[PDB]
Amino acid sequence: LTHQQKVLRLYKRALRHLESWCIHRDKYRYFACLLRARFDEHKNEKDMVKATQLLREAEEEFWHGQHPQPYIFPESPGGTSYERYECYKVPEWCLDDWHPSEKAMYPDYFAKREQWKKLRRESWEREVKQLQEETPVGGPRTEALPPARKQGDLPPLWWHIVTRPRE
């Protein structure tokens, strides 16, 4: 993380912590531009300690008095009912063993199920042809070419390209 974008990680949560405490909507909305004037103290300057002392005093009065049980937007890392839908929980590929008269239903769905597998069954003449080439030695985050230079299939095929939908 860099020093300039360290301002941005605080700036969104500076106002996000405030609407936890408000009672109206305009009461929170009146303090948006009102807090903006403090942000408009040093508009554009150098990147040295003058920009760090604006953040070094943003240690206090940001963590100091921070969010007394705030809003959480319940579908989140925290919050209630964040992972509540777990009786279903999307068991993708639980459907290998059937021993049919249980595979009687959905006839066209299984006919398409084996169809997509040939896209995964034939990708390593193309994906592994660039997997040895795109990585220089052992370097950074290893996504492929996002078109794979002819046809990107996927590169992340198929557990990510057919990833779990929510309900």
Partner 1 sequence: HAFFKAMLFMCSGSIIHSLNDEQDIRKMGGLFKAMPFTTTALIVGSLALTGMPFLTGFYSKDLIIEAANTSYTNAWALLMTLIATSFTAIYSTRIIFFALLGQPRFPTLVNINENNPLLINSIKRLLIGSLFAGYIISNNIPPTTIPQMTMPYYLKTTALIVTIL
Partner 2 sequence: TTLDPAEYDISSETRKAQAERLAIRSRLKREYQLQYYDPSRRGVIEDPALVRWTYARSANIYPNFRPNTKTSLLGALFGIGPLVFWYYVFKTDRDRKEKLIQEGKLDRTFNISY
Partner 3 sequence: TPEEKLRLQQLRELRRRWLKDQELSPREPVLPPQRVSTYRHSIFAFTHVLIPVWIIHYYLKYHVTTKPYTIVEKKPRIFPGDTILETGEV
Q: Which of 30, 45, 137 is nearest to 55 (CA)?
A: 45
Query: Which residues touch 51 (CB under 8 Å, ≥6 apart)?
Result: 3, 42, 45
Q: How far apart are CA 58 and CA 64, in angstroms?
A: 10
From residue 33 to residue 62, what is the string marking binding to partner 2 with x (rule CB under 8 A)? Answer: --------------x----x------x---
Query: Binding residue for partner 2 (CB under 8 A) from 43, 84, 121, 150?
Result: 121
Q: How far apart are CA 99 and CA 75, in angstroms?
A: 38
Binding at 66: pick from partner 3, partner 2, partner 1, none (beta carbon under 5-8 Å per type): none
Binding at 71: pick from partner 1, partner 3, partner 2, none (beta carbon under 5-8 Å per type): partner 1
- Cis peptide upstream of residue 154 (ω within 30 degrees of 0): yes
Q: Is 87 in the site for partner 1 (CB under 8 A)?
A: no
Residue 96 phi/psi, 5-degree rounding, is -80, -60
23, two tokens? 């009672």
Q: Is 97 in the site for partner 2 (CB under 8 A)?
A: no
Q: How far is the CB of 81 from partner 1 (least distance, A)?
A: 7
- Which of 99, 121 has the CB closer to partner 2? 121
Q: What is the contact surface with partner 2 in residues (CB under 8 A)? A: 3, 47, 52, 59, 117, 120-121, 124, 131, 135, 138-142, 156-157, 159
